[model samples]
Target chain A: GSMERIKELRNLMSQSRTREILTKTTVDHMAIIKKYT
Target chain B: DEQMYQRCCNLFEKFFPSSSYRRPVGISSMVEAMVSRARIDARIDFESGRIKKEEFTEIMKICSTIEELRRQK
Candidate 1:
């Protein structure tokens, strides 16, 4: 179910490695944002 | 830009298996889901005083920028 997936997604997001990747990805996105605007 | 997008796709597929969804979902949809989740989490953090106003603004900026990138052709 969608609710189950959402819960799983939240749990995954909270993982230390997942948070690290999200942070790194955000940093990469900021670089791209700087390139354009 | 393409590589960045691909990296996002890879991350999504790794964490969220497509089989779990009711129907098929594309990379764009996955990115949208992530942006939505990120925005909600950022707001919670802001409201709880876990992050400053500037940090909240920066996170919102990143969310919008990524959404724009996902819409690109």
Candidate 2:
């Protein structure tokens, strides 16, 4: 069950928008919050 | 600083609902890696005076949002 969910999440993360959000870290973070805020 | 922390919370909250729908994993791994490394890097900055106490606290607050979202649903 956990593995399947991981697979799904990995799948979702492959998409551009979700990938961008997930990987947006310290240096690139502010830009993401700017979009939501 | 408070506003910034709240913004992080909102953005991280964005992930929670969707992630719950999908169920999840390396999301936690990613959070661990990111938050762990963030602390290491932030500590360096803090000690060097690049960021003050409040800034360090704010950074952890933002990282904590991710940590919370990373929890299994």
Candidate 3:
């Protein structure tokens, strides 16, 4: 549901890439990638 | 994603829900900046420097794997 902010993020983070990087939230996403990549 | 927000109550939101398509002090974005419904370790008060590892939920997928495959020569 795009009705809320977290709801929207849930869809994007549900990807395999997100899991590979161990990103819980969007903000933590980049930081996670930065660590490894 | 609403379906994934299984435990919004425990998922300490507000601070982490940032805005991207909108500007600061402008308006709350209709879009979210995250992905899945974290089933555990959902909340953390950064200022307190406290962490709850038990609550660290992970995304698990059910898949079939082939550790030893038969190769055709």
Candidate 4:
């Protein structure tokens, strides 16, 4: 059947988004407080 | 930012269960990740079903930007 690839594609897109976020910042703070202040 | 996400959004909402997310964007997620890989396939793993090991790994290569950001100064 192969079914709909929505989930796979969503995953792929989400991966892309995550990549964008990763390369955008470098603070790597566990909590926003550190970065916020 | 999990704790912060909770505390701030808590104040930000003041009446709703805002944890669904402060902003489900990847850029924000990466900012929130601080310690996490920030890319590890993000939401696609948890949202989608896996045949065997759907999220066994974090496909970190997708996070090449992480490496770039490291040297971006």
Candidate 5:
């Protein structure tokens, strides 16, 4: 079940818009995002 | 906009457990700040149109990962 959310996140990240919006976040989130992708 | 505020409120209700609404006396400041900032920023980002509902969902997914790490300690 844990990977379910991660799968959705990966789908979202596959879009450039998601990446662009994430760049607005602090390093706090960026590092975490990298772990999943 | 009452509707917008309520949208944020409902999102928050989902984001946090009902118990977290009040400040408890015992948690470390780091955990306190972590929870507080995560809620605040997510609400602002979602309500301001900076992020869509699906993006907010993705953010919460990331948050649950953080939750797992916190639990590991």
Candidate 6:
């Protein structure tokens, strides 16, 4: 069960476009984006 | 978007049970590690001119939603 959940989480993470966006930018860039939008 | 967010919360909670005495590396840490790898990949693509500035900016917007979710108490 634990392994299954971990696998599911990994799958979700892989499919996440939002996660991709967050990963690509630095914290500073994230701050600016948050400020503007 | 909300569905995905809720699903992530559920999975995160399962990964780090409140009652567990031996706290393992958290789901957040796992996610962060994955994100870190992706960041390196993105940087390489950008530096090599595989992806343009506008495209980078657009893709970066997805982070905002993730940040908002992470900030939730």
By lDDT rank, best first, the candidates go 1, 2, 6, 5, 4, 3
State residue B12's C-alpha deviation in candidate 6, in Å: 0.7
Q: What is the C-alpha RMSD of each candidate to the true structure, in Å?
A: 13.4, 15.2, 14.3, 11.4, 15.3, 14.4
lDDT of 3 at B2: 32
lDDT of 1 at A27: 26
lDDT, candidate 3, B1-73, per-residue tens: 4323333312324323445232222222211222222211133322243433332222111000100110111
Report the number of clashing residue pairs per model. Answer: 0, 0, 9, 3, 0, 0
DockQ of every candidate: 0.04, 0.04, 0.06, 0.11, 0.04, 0.07
Q: What is the DockQ of candidate 2?
A: 0.04
Kindly report which residue pairs in candidate 5 clash with one another.
Answer: none
- Residue B46 in candidate 6, Cα distance off native in Å: 42
Lowest-scoring 10 consecutive residues by lDDT in candidate 1 chain A? A1-10
lDDT of 6: 0.47
* Candidate 6 CAPRI category: incorrect
Which residue runs does candidate 2 get wrong by more than 4 Å? Answer: A1-37, B1-28
TM-scores, each model vs. reference: 0.44, 0.41, 0.21, 0.24, 0.36, 0.37
Clashing pairs in 3: A1-B1, A5-B32, A9-B34, A9-B35, A10-B34, A10-B35, A13-B35, B40-B55, B41-B55
Displacement of residue B57 (Cα, Å) in model 6 is: 38
The lDDT for every candidate, in the order shown, is 0.52, 0.49, 0.28, 0.35, 0.44, 0.47
Docking class of 3: incorrect
lDDT score, residue B12, model 2?
Answer: 43
lDDT of 1 by residue, B1-73 (tens): 4554454445554434556553222332454556675667677878898878877776777666655554543
Which candidate comes out best when scored by DockQ?
A: 4
Chain B vs. true chain B: TM-score for each candidate?
0.62, 0.54, 0.19, 0.25, 0.48, 0.47
User: Candidate 4 versus the native: TM-score?
Assistant: 0.24
Q: How well is candidate 3 docked (DockQ)?
A: 0.06
